[PDB]
Symmetry: C3
Subunit: 200 residues, 3 copies
């Protein structure tokens, strides 16, 4: 006897078929549908749905439909946020993105997991831990960010990464599981790609 809602915040196992959760979900997923199916020319429309879908959205935010979430109202986005096609966020709990964050296509964030033992999840039980994307972070394509992960500022996450651990700031991380490939140093102020110098 503890409201599901309060079990989420406590990191306890819960289910979401009650206490107004389903109604919340239908509100968000309703806005999601008119965004996702809006005509590319309906820019103002899209512009308001964004402010509308997420609990928090800074200025100069852009999201290439389609976009997917469970609620929408648990996603708090910062300034100048760009997200490319198919950004999926399972926001059963807090998801926070800093400023000037760039998100490539087909990225997946999820504060939710299921107990490994199929007996702790007989009724699709879940747990939720907040994700936190720092400022000036860049996430490559097909990246997956798992429950309770924090990505430090100005860091980069390579395409295909499966982030399962916290990622410090100022690094470059990649792999399955995602691991720190390396620190970003002055050479990166000159070389922006493979063998290409900033001064051509």
């Amino acid at each position: 006897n503890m409201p599901m809602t309060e079990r989420i915040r406590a990191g306890k196992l819960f289910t979401d078929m009650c206490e107004g959760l389903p109604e919340k979900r239908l509100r968000g997923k309703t806005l999601m549908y008119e965004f996702n199916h809006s005509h590319p020319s309906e820019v103002e429309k899209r512009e308001s749905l964004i402010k509308e879908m997420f609990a928090t959205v800074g200025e100069n935010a852009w999201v290439e439909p389609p976009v997917y979430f469970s609620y929408g109202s648990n996603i708090h986005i910062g300034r100048n946020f760009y997200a490319n096609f198919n950004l999926t966020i399972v926001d059963d709990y807090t998801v926070t993105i800093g400023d000037n964050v760039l998100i490539a296509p087909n990225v997946t964030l999820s504060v939710t997991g299921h107990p490994v033992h199929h007996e702790l999840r007989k009724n699709g039980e879940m747990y939720s831990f907040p994700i936190t994307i720092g400022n000036n972070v860049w996430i490559g394509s097909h990246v997956v960010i798992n429950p309770g992960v924090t990505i430090g500022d100005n860091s980069v996450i390579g395409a295909g990464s499966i982030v399962t651990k916290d990622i410090p700031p100022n690094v470059v991380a990649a792999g399955v599981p995602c691991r720190v490939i390396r620190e970003i140093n002055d050479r990166d102020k000159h070389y922006y790609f493979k063998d290409y110098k900033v001064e051509s």
Copy 2:
């Protein structure tokens, strides 16, 4: 002497632009279309389309649109099935899923593949080997399951896994390619995440 119908069943190479296959594909993608572009409030309709779309569906099935498949009628689902956003199932041949199966967002299932040799696929020839998912299986995000793969009951597939070989029951598997990581023991019956236990 053997139709393409019999070739698929036999595991032999084939092509699907005859024997009514194309027309079969159209019927399924038509219901698929209606399902994928349905309003979140069209609850009844969504439920009826599901029992329509797939060959078999057990009680309490839930698929979060959009869903993608080739025929849909080659897929058999057990009971209490929950698939999140963008489940993709290339079912040129039979796909069987058990009960209490949980599928995270952006998961691709595929019974189909193509000869490695470009000489064998001059006309895009393929082979199809059924996929079999046990009961109480949980599949992480961005996981891909290749042709003829069998996942043993109660097993867990970590996010981003690329499954090319059969997974035994009662295991936690992950990686690229997927490798059995450990056995699911009774220590999992208390712990569900890092160091979070369960009390009375």
Copy 3:
């Protein structure tokens, strides 16, 4: 610096909010919307759009909706092209696909990337390097192909690989990051999958 469209062609850092780039994108995303939302029965309309969406498309092209791209007009496709669901192509610059190329579902092609050093991207500045996919290439599901990569003729990219470097022709590459597994020999002329021969 110098004009934005030039920086592109020169592999220099650029932003795309001028020189008519946004409008160019709107026509693209417009034809894209018309394609993605078409009905499975509207085959003739789907074919006109294919020819209209991309710069060049050889005969026999088939693209299963939905398909995603930035401009569309920066894509050149050969002949007997086949792409399954959710092909995403960030064609900020040229993307060339040869003949008899088969693409599995959920593949992402991006000629664009961002300077890893945040100071070099304050205004989400990016670079773009063409992508060249040879003839008779087969790309598996959930593959990601990064900027300026060349996939040789007759090669195969396993499901889930993250292709960061060029792939030689006649090989089988897979992995994160993608690495050459072996060369396509003549045994591949008999065995097409795990242990199945052609005549026996």
